[PDB]
Design a protein around this ligand. Structure first.
Ligand SMILES: CCCCCCCCCCCCC/C=C\[C@H](O)[C@H](N)CO
Ligand SMILES: CCCCCCCCCCCCC/C=C\[C@H](O)[C@H](N)CO
Lengths: 48, 97, 245, 297, 245, 297, 49
């Protein structure tokens, strides 16, 4: 959850709305197990 | 790190680029809520936009810590302090800050 | 390299890119009570990380006419998280505190808050105006809780003492053109090694604007001041049922 | 026995108070060293940042060209004992004949030094104080006259029975300390130790003495510190019949072997009540003299 | 010198002058989770004395027709004292237990209770009597809380298993002509190093009369059975807001 | 750094499990030693105190005069692997032509060994179990006949897409493991590892899988252990058109490299449902045979 | 903006315990991931077609 701790303050002449971009990844203790097929199959009919 | 589509709401072709970023703006000082999402990386939702979530789909189990880095793209004159919180299992969506 | 800072304790981490160093009250760090200063014989509980973390308890709005506020410690936390719980089940409590008052604005706003810590902050009344009436402040004014309380006569700190000499107490200033937060670390201050977290407030935190907030029409007018604090070296003794007061 | 790492490397229990500062000997004022002009970049002693919360470190030598001055000015008179070990009035007790107050030949004075402003203001400069004290009792008639009368002063600690008459059995003083002296004698004088159950008396206690709901009725107890309530001081003329003369006793206290902690702003509004910082809200005066303009004297 | 005993832990001390030794379940003492068995990375809180003490939670009356009762751990304590609080603010919990079931009578009364500990005590229903209905026990039957719950079919432990073979679980007997209490010490039992004190009950305590209570008319007929227990080596992790379920 | 005594001498953090007992080699049954008569006071092996909770320590030698017997009877057959590493039926899958169930040429079997009593009862003797397993698939027509038909078995872990038709794209099996075999071939057989996220599978989980109010609707989830839900096993005839013959697949499981913890009473009431100890309340039968009198056979 | 991923570790953002992680990373190697046969071609040889 993301909350306003104080407020987004800006002086005269600057936009009142700005954006945040979020980037995500895993830490170094991260591992995966039990190789399976993914839930998505990007194909409708036969690929020609 | 790949982009997390926290703002996974717009669906019309012409607005898909908007899911790539969420906003912030001047508020009323009530410690208002800005956004929320599940931390589950291999679950449907924002994480599906990340390569992590994608690779995650080829494995049944996983273990590890995760990290999300937020980049502010406002003007240089904009200031602000945000409180970002991870709520471990069992705790429901925080009603307030 | 002094303007930037990070405070991590418990499962909470605080950052700031416009700091003005850190004050360690009375030049001393929070420590646990020694076996020679101690008097009570029961082995204490020191919950560590579950209570020595950062609680973010309040947000006030700074206005061109604000007078100032104060909060009492540990009163502000007695009903919060695991710390509040221990403070309730136990008779005896001791701890230090790391206070982080936050307030950011813009390079076009101006104003300066004085953030200080006043041990044994006893509140007084105006004695019926004339001074003929021996009135006393109500519980809600002496232990305002987490919402704090607004000063009625900041100049005399609602206690007959000059705010001009308040700097003799551990403090910092949040002068917008310079910083966006104050950080003060406070050790346990009392004449006893332990005490009631309920009946006695070791000190009060004061946040008073000395140089009024100002900005031209058009700049964000909502300037919040948020209070975050973390107990340090929390110790508890004298266990029984929980009590709120 | 401990085994998990976090437990071993834990600092939980450290009872040593890491101290960032330490006291140094300072018998005299500091000396002034010679200084010459400085025309440098990077070096800027004059500029400070008060927001930090520390006082300016800029010295004379760095702001002007100074000569050398060997300063031998003593700093001895500003030590706690120099400042406090001077007897001052703390109590006044009246023993009138035909009166509204003590027409019964005796009086009980609850030991409280906050009744007089001069003394009170000094001590309240600190929050906590520990010391021994010398008490001196000056007695005479209301005109400042000396009469051949015998008195008894008795220290009544909390819990001991308080005399309720000039003939109370309490005056037997089998265990309490009492002083028998005449007005004709020089003033009585004694030494008293540090008697609080606390490590120090405290002029300010921000709290309540008991648990419970703190309703309006029990608001008179806000700030009540039992640790400062040392007891009663009772005086009486020594006789069964009433004394022929009206008396007044002035109590002077001189602190000695003093220690103080936590300095605070000094009172700037007239005092109104004992142990209670109430001030007249309608007569809130500025700390000092005022003028018509900031650009004029 | 085995009939007499004293258990002191925390600020609580228990005595008995008619004991029958102490059982240490599965021949092993409660220990803290090792750095190699552990998986969660946050530094845990180990409140010690404030939670590892003796809580006396219930008293049931033994009657000539009583069937028997059971309690679930740690369910019984989740709403009690400082322990209950930690179990609520934290996701993860682990601990051991020292159980002390008490029941005294006279040299003229008779009867024998079986006191046992059954890990993962899953409850079953009678499936509509006929066995054609797939019913399931309600929350109040699976986690009866502190009041425990009375067995409906003690012979099959309300779970299709013979109570006659229950002795294969750590246990003791309170045979009135011999002792007046059972004391069993239990280590953490699970396939995970930590778990929810709310969603999962590591084991159930059973107290069942196998040799019915009896006495002649005139002897005190009110024979209570009291339950007292103490968590041991309590560890907690995964902090957030308090949650009751 | 630590300093206060109670902290230093604290045992908080001890991760070693003090164990009161230890395993010893026991390849054969125990021997019997010679014994003679004993007429002593104080020595009383026969008398015990079951209340304690331990089994009788009285041996043969101390209750009767015994000869010497060298016992070489092996104890090898009662080891966990000897007892469990024997394949038994755990699943049955039907692939009929014209039917109500799988007339679509494929089937999904949620891996659960509690469908068959013989096997189920054995494992439920323990609470926790960790092991590897060998699966064998025996296929034939309902008459036990062998036909020239080709099948595909695919292991579908939780999260992988489940085939919904004999022609599902899922059958591409790019990452899942699949086995292609004919009925004419000997039965297919594979090894499977220990796949739980837990250190052991548990036949009994006294709890709920999620937080929240546990109302009537969500009571079907009491005892639901995701850690035991290994996935689905899907089979299909390999073709676009429907198979000419009806089929049945029997799944046999043989545990190997077994470890078990916490023994429990063995089921004594007929099983009614998979993963759920429900028993018929009206047909509660005594564990064994019964007789007319205790004084007769 | 630099183009690198965050170097911040768990230890520096919260107070961590010690954990000896023996979780294998073997299953995510290229061969583990790819050396699993999958359908790539289908060929039909009908009679009357
Ligand atoms: C022969 C009897 C002589 C009388 C002895 C008097 C001893 C008094 C001890 C000095 C205590 C210092 C004053 C303490 C507290 C202040 O007066 C007020 N109570 C503060 O509210
Ligand atoms: C080629 C595919 C072969 C199929 C592979 C099947 C692997 C199954 C792993 C064995 C898991 C043991 C059984 C676990 C749990 C029990 O059956 C129940 N769920 C208990 O409620």
């Amino acid at each position: 959850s993301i909350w306003y701790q104080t407020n987004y303050v800006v002086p005269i002449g600057a936009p009142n709305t700005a954006y945040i971009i979020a980037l995500a990844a895993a830490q170094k203790n991260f591992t995966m197990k039990l190789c399976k097929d993914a839930s998505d199959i990007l194909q409708t009919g036969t690929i020609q | 790190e790949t982009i997390l589509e926290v703002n996974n709401v717009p669906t019309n072709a012409t607005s898909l680029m908007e899911r790539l970023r969420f906003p912030v703006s001047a508020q009323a000082g009530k410690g208002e809520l800005c956004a929320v999402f599940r931390a589950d990386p291999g679950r449907n939702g924002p994480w599906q936009s990340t390569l992590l979530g994608q690779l995650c789909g080829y494995y049944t189990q996983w273990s590890g810590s995760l990290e999300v880095t937020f980049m502010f793209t406002g003007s240089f004159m904009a200031t602000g302090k945000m409180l970002i919180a991870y709520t471990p299992p069992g705790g429901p969506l925080p009603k307030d800050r | 390299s002094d303007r930037v800072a990070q405070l991590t304790i418990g499962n909470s981490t605080i950052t700031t890119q416009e700091a003005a160093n850190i004050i360690v009250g009375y030049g001393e760090w929070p420590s646990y009570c020694s076996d020679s200063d101690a008097t009570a014989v029961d082995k204490p509980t020191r919950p560590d990380v579950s209570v020595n973390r950062f609680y973010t308890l309040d947000t006030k709005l700074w206005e061109k006419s604000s007078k100032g506020w104060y909060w009492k410690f540990p009163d502000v936390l007695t009903e919060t998280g695991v710390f509040g719980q221990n403070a309730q089940f136990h008779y005896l409590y001791r701890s230090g505190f790391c206070i982080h008052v936050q307030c950011n604005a813009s390079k076009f706003h101006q104003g300066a808050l004085l953030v200080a810590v006043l041990p044994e902050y006893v509140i007084g009344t105006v004695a019926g105006g004339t001074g003929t009436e021996d009135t006393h402040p109500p519980y809600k004014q002496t232990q305002p809780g987490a919402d704090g309380f607004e000063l009625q006569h900041p100049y005399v700190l609602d206690a007959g003492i000059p705010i001009s000499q308040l700097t003799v107490c551990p403090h910092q200033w949040i002068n917008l053109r310079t910083n966006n937060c104050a950080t003060i670390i406070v050790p346990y201050i009392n004449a006893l090694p332990f005490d009631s977290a309920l009946n006695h407030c070791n000190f009060g935190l004061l946040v008073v604007p000395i140089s009024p907030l100002d900005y031209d029409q058009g700049a964000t007018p909502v300037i919040p001041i948020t209070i975050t604090l973390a107990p340090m070296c929390s110790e508890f003794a004298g266990l029984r049922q929980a009590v709120t007061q | 026995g401990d085994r998990v790492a976090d437990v071993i490397e834990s600092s939980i229990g450290d009872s040593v108070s890491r101290a960032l500062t330490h006291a140094l000997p300072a018998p005299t004022g500091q000396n002034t060293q010679v200084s010459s002009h400085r025309l440098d970049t990077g070096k800027v002693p004059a500029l400070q940042a008060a927001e930090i919360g520390a006082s300016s470190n800029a010295s004379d030598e760095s702001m002007i060209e100074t000569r050398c001055v060997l300063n031998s000015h003593s700093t001895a008179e500003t030590t706690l004992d120099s400042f406090f070990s001077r007897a001052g009035l703390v109590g006044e007790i009246d023993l009138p004949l035909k009166g509204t107050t003590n027409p019964n030949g005796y009086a009980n004075w609850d030991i409280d030094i906050t009744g007089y402003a001069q003394m009170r203001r000094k001590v309240e400069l600190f929050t906590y104080m520990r010391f021994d004290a010398e008490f001196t009792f000056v007695a005479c008639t209301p005109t400042g006259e000396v009469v051949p009368q015998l008195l008894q002063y008795m220290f009544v600690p909390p819990g001991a029975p308080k005399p309720d008459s000039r003939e109370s059995l309490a005056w037997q003083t089998a265990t309490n300390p009492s002083v028998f002296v005449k007005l004709s004698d020089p003033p009585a004088q004694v030494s008293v130790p540090f008697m609080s159950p606390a490590s120090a008396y405290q002029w300010f206690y921000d709290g309540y003495p008991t648990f419970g709901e703190h309703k309006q009725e029990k608001d008179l107890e806000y700030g009540a510190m039992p640790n400062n309530m040392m007891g009663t001081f009772s005086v009486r003329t020594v006789g069964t019949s009433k004394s022929k003369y009206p008396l007044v006793v002035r109590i002077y206290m001189r602190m000695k072997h003093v220690r103080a902690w936590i300095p605070r702003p000094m009172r700037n509004q007239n005092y109104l009540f004992k142990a209670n910082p109430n001030y007249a809200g309608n007569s809130i005066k500025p700390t000092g003299a005022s003028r018509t303009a900031i650009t004029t004297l």
